[model samples]
Target chain A: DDAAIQQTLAKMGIKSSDIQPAPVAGMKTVLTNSGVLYITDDGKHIIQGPMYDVSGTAPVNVTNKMLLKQLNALEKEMIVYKAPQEKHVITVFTDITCGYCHKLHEQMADYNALGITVRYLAFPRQGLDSDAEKEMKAIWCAKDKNKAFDDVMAGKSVAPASCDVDIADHYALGVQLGVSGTPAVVLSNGTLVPGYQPPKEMKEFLDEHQKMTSGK
Target chain B: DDAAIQQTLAKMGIKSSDIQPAPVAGMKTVLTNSGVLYITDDGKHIIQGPMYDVSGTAPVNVTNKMLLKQLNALEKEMIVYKAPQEKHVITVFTDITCGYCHKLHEQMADYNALGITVRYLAFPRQGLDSDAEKEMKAIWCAKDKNKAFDDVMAGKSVAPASCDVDIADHYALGVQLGVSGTPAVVLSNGTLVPGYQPPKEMKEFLDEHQKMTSGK
Candidate 1:
């Protein structure tokens, strides 16, 4: 039955390897180049929207949970900007060419001062093989990654470099996590706060999320 | 168990009368003033987005299906602009002050010439008690309803009239069917084709939909 389901999706131009069991019964989640989709096990239908699990203590977004699991597995590979005394860590899907990404990077000190560790995951909005992707790869491959990232975000050009760095994997992860734009922040609890959020507001949200998750 | 669900919703300020069994098992759909929401049968959680039934012949939008059912039930109350030799009829949720609604009305003769009958239902974008709603009420209550509607669409004032016409019911129907703006068209099969579509394009869509529904 699983083979049949995979075959059906494959016929629709999606790879068999991308299909996985979804949180909802009778449905499977398919990871596409575009984004994630939920399909029936029979493969006759496909849904392109969020799925919620209202059976929990509160409404838990199961779709986000699935994405967070994937993000966690790749935690070691993410280019992190760690705070000296880290109070919170947020994984941000970013593009080097995006204006919001530049603004967020400009306020790096403010976020660090608030005890927030910002982990960077490459999400070149222009897609694979574009100038943005090449630049992102260069940033990830640089000897001093932090300085290279800072320089690029500050509107300075860096020498093009290439490595075995999982830059494509980072972009793929961002897509699976539903990162449509730059500065999509994924909190430790897997909650995605999309778009550029001010340091103070982000701190407040992180603090509130921490309290909710800790049940205090 | 149902009583518990009602009590849970009551505590959250939602009326018990607004709750109904949802398409998904173990969940109920609630009609709130803010919009539609899905809640667990136990009432511990709520969801505020579209739900899909991916187990069908195609991905059936279960929420839209629910809204269509309601729309079909209120068909008799709609103010219809019948084509002389009608081949197709579409129900349109309209607002007096909306720019697109005027554009659609300007091309009414073209749509009618193509054998497409248009039905009007009031949808005041500024809510039930606004001036747009009052004007919509006046148009519906006018002796020459069609002429009054034309006058309003042409940016000319019509003599204000009041009657037993359920203008509020039309507005409520628009909300229940998820009509955020004017010129939202609903076809014979309850398919919502939102926004102003050109006459020729709309005719092609209707023809294709007719073929699909007829198993052609």
Candidate 2:
């Protein structure tokens, strides 16, 4: 029975939405409130790292596969800055007041010039209902979301506004996605890159990564 | 048969010092230079979390058991400030330049008054061959280590010195032990506490924790 797993999770005050057998035998991929966890049926031990599939020429991250799926489902809510040429799309979880987020925003022209579209997801860094969350909500609810975002990133504040958007869920999702800081970029292929990257270097990296992933 | 494991690890540039059957079957506990990892035999999966034993009344951390053993071996090298009453001893991995470390040191009177002895281990925050490392080496090689440490914490520069003290090993060890910041405390048991706690509150915590561990 799965009683052992349930009982163990209970002690840690952790809940699992679902559990499935992992690629590696004798372990289960448990979808938990915090993130994905790899577990044994006996529940005597919980391993806290990402699982990888080394079956291919290069080690493919199976952990990000789950994260990517979750992230993809949230796409309808993201604020888009579409590229004119549209060679690549990079979704960034950002906080308006964050230093690097400001730095990343300043290079919007450069990024778009390099055929990179930017999408904004709310990760206020201060958690739900704080100043940042409110700002993010206002930015999301604004008539011109991009203009409102740019204005706010320029150290101006937005009018307090409310919307049907799931601002809290975005924060929770970023936490689950392993967002360690502001300006976390999620590539199309499910890898969450944490931190600001110059457009020139990032495009180069994305180009190489796409070549590998696409061909393989 | 274990070729899958080796080939996979090699691709990742990870070398395993040894591999053994983990308590959770179908997984191997891989001892790598970074830390212990629970890996699958097929090398298709590597779990990035710590393992736990839930068979007991309380969940006991099987992961910290390895860390505690390694820490225990490094005890003789630690710089100690023993209290006359010595009710409890707290081993702190400290940086001379850290703000919280300075705060913790300032309250040495309160700690020693509460029958708490403070033991210092070199965790300069700066990696090897750094200013802090040199200061740590100077402090370690001093005729009166406690006085030298006090002077440095008070912003006084000690005469530059060198010794046989394994400062770099201490830095590497701190990384493996999950020291996220300066002034990380190791209780008598295996738990690594990652921030500054005042003596009164800390003593109460230690007393309670000891009660839980002792009878259990």
Candidate 3:
């Protein structure tokens, strides 16, 4: 049993210090700062995301692949402000109230000039009905929407405005997207970029990703 | 096909004004203030949540069940003081630093008088290593842990202390259990009571749940 534990730990990239007995009997769990990892008694296996059978010829991981598809579908509907010479599109889930978001918006010209189309999705860290959400709705419903957006992001207060806005819907979708903070970016290939990457880094990423997909 | 579409909508409790072609070919989507509802071309089927099967289960809905579970688990490990009485134990995830948690702590006598022992788990909303978590750990590691806990709940700060505490583990588990806020209660039978329920309401819940589980 000790040998089995040692073998399993090695397989799971775990040291003996990592695994410990859970409160429940007969179960051993790995104690990590992030999460508690559960393992069987013999420690022969470790569970991560999901497990599935792959008997079919198509190399199927149905749940894994489907999750990716769902992410793509949601990214598709995020508010898009495409560049005129759009060479690449990046979907960004943003909070109007976030400082980083303001910084990102300030660099919009540079991004657009670089042929990178910027798409925005609403992710109010506050609830959908909060002041942030109200502000976003005002921006979305404005006569000159882009100017109104820029104004708010620049820390100017707009007249409280309301319309037949789906800001609530967008906020809910953001929650479903598992966004905790603002300015979460998703690439053309559905790769998530967590926080602010400088314009040059983003450009390189776009170029590299585009080439990879095209080559394939 | 129209009848089938209507039937699918009815089953899903969706009241659609119109059905139109989605951005994706062959997939039709309905517009709602809540979300863009997707359906097959014939509209006989509708997919909600992430349409990925986890293991054998239908796609894990993010904001619904999984989130709830994570919140509940978080609550379970966050209670600072637990009274293990001979009577039935009702585990409560609480934070002494929170107002509602204080109210629940104040009502401990009422719950105990009803032959219900209130067990506490510490959930520091600011997270582990925060002042709240440190205070909770100090209370737990104090000479008179129960009294120290009571003092903190009564709006007195305990002396600062630290050790190899399970605060992080507790917090992590709380997230997994879905403990979003404090003063959440879980019964031995695994029934969850969210938010601040008055003494009488809690008593009724305990009595009813006890009967249900005993009967089984």
| Candidate with best TM-score | 1
- Candidate 1 segments exceeding 4 Å error: A10-17, A23-26, A52-59, A155-157, B1-216
Better of 1 and 2 by TM-score: 1
- Please state the error at residue A169 of candidate 1 in Å: 2.8
Clashing pairs in 2: A47-B49, A48-B48, A48-B49, A48-B50, A49-B48, A49-B49
- Say which prediction, candidate 2 or candidate 3, comes out ahead on TM-score: 2
Give the C-alpha miss distance for residue A70 in model 3, angstroms. 6.6
In model 2, the Cα lDDT at residue B86 comes to 88
Question: TM-score for every candidate vs. truth?
Answer: 0.45, 0.44, 0.37
TM-score for candidate 3, please give it.
0.37
Find the 10 residues in a row with the least total lDDT in model 1 chain A: A1-10
Tens digits of per-residue lDDT, candidate 1, B1-216, equal: 233454565567642134555767567777654567888866688898677898858887777777777777667657678887799999999987898888888988889989999998888888866888888888988888888999888878778987756566677667666677778997776667789899999889898889888865
Give all candidate RMSDs, comma-separated.
23.2, 24.1, 22.5
Cα lDDT of model 2 by residue, B9-68, tens digit: 667776323354466755676655466778886678999768888997877777677667
List per-model TM-scores for chain B: 0.78, 0.78, 0.59
Off by over 4 Å in 3: A1-79, B1-216
lDDT of 3 at B104: 76
DockQ score of each predicted structure, in the order shown? 0.01, 0.01, 0.01
By summed lDDT, the worst window of 10 consecutive residues in model 3 chain B runs over: B15-24
Pick out the ten consecutive residues of candidate 2 chain B with the lowest summed lDDT.
Answer: B14-23
